Amino acid sequence: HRICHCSNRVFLCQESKVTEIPSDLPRNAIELRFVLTKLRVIQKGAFSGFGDLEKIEISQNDVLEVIEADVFSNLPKLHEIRIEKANNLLYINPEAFQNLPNLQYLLISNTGIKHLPDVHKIHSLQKVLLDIQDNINIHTIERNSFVGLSFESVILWLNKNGIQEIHNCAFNGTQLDELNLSDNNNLEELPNDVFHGASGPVILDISRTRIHSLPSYGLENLKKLRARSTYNLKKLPTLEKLVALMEASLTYPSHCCAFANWRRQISEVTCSPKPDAFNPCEDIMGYNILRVLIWFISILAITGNIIVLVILTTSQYKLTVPRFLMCNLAFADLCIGIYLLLIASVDIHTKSQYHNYAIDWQTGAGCDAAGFFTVFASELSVYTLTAITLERWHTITHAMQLDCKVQLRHAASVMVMGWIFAFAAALFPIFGISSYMKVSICLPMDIDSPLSQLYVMSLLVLNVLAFVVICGCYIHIYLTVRNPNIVSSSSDTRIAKRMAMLIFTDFLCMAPISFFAISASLKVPLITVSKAKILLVLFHPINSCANPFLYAIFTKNFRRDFFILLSK
């Protein structure tokens, strides 16, 4: 052919020279392919007479705008139809497709058509697989849209569509085998009578959709259900309706745990993701000993922080920069203890029934608040420890200047900046950067998205760098203090001892947790979720609880101040 290459009865028309369908193409051609054609409008009945045609492929039809009626008319052997890259194709003739008994595959992608093509006249005898995707212009599905597509079972691949609403009885009169509606961001709800008059679907794929709830009827024949990333699907229909449901791919491990409990009751379905120790359905704490110790630890931490703050504020002596740092550390410890007490209360309230309230707790504002509070407390404590270590190092190594030219105003400004940074970090999970609902302890373990993983890695790196800097400063201060060439003061020795104790406690509390978090972030979890929860419950608040006794209570001045206050 002059305009299209011919080989084994296959015509491959390409280039811009193809402004219209050539009428000279042999009627016996088996496959016709149009790539990067300049055709704007497809003439009606263009493919008429192509009895031997088996497959039709249209791609890169940027200039294509309209398809005339009866184009795909009276094709006995036409089994596969492919349309792609037809961005300008906004209008499709309703009667374009008709009389296709042997139709088996119909792929339409990258099309600007705002309405689904009318395939009622297809009347395909064999199974027809519909593959409609990248149809942003399509927003609604009319009733009986797929009616008359084919007599046998048909698979409707409608993923990557802009469908926002679905009318009742949309699939009525259709033998839906598998449905692929995933990637429908605008899909918010599905009518109950959507499947009325239809068969199946056997397999449903609603992953990455905003469907609030599934239809209460028509799912009896659903064998497989896919709802990955379907956050809006907080609650699913009763297991009784899904009798045929054999496999499930949801996005809420709590729902899978509830189904497992129902399976045990039935005994007295492969559902993923399976429950795990990160989000237990029995109890958040799990171990009775850990739950009992948690309340005591939280109470002790809160009492110690309150006592330290009261003593520091009521002290008659002048409030030094170290006093402000100790007050900030006590406030951070009190916040951590409050978060721990809230977690313990939540665990105790739902004892033996966490599974029922697991969804509410994880999705509730309480979990987000607890996670934000824990993150803010940890950031504030780290910043305060780093600032105290830096001030001590400047005072010791720069004995010429009291604190390397440091005053109360500078310390207050540094504390304010650290508090602002901690608040910003704690607000990140609330702003969609990762999520605290991924764990029952409200920890921001969500790293599925690149942004959340990057934020977690950055936080871990910052914590590690701060710890390393603090350790180096402490080592330098200790070396300087013991140097015989420098006459270290007794107050300097006491400050060094207190700083060493605080640094040792912080390192003991943080190093294991930091290492575990780093390992987990790299997709190499070296510890189970149950062990990690216990470690975070015990080690993390242990440092905060020991901070008062290590820093202030052990100090002679603090003891004297407490004794004076007690005399009042």
Numbering used by the authors: 20 to 287, 344 to 643
How do the authors describe this structure?
Follicle stimulating hormone (FSH) is an essential glycoprotein hormone for human reproduction, which functions are mediated by a G protein-coupled receptor, FSHR. There are three members of glycoprotein hormone receptors, FSHR, LHCGR and TSHR, which are activated to mainly couple the Gs protein and lead to up-regulation of the secondary message cAMP in cells. FSH acts through FSHR, which is mainly expressed in gonads (ovaries in female and testes in male). Here we report cryo-EM structures of FSHR in both inactive and active states, with the active structure bound to FSH and an allosteric agonist compound 21 f.
To obtain stable inactive FSHR proteins for cryo-EM structure determination, a small molecular antagonist, compound 2427, was added during FSHR expression and purification. Through numerous data collection, we were able to obtain a structure of wild type FSHR in the inactive state at a global resolution of 6.01 Å. The EM map was sufficient to place the receptor ECD and TMD, while the density of compound 24 was not observed. Structural comparison of the inactive FSHR with the inactive LHCGR and TSHR structures reveals that all three receptors have a similar ECD down conformation. The ECD of FSHR has a nearly identical position as the LHCGR ECD but a 7°–8° rotation close to the membrane layer relative to the ECD of the inactive TSHR. Interestingly, the hinge helix in the inactive FSHR structure is elongated and shows different orientation from the hinge helix in the active FSHR structure, highlighting that hinge helix plays an important role during FSHR activation. In contrast, the hinge helix in the inactive FSHR structure shows rare interactions with ECL1 by rotating approximately 30° counter-clockwise relative to the hinge helix from the active FSHR structure, thus confirming that the interactions between hinge helix and ECL1 is critical for FSHR activation.
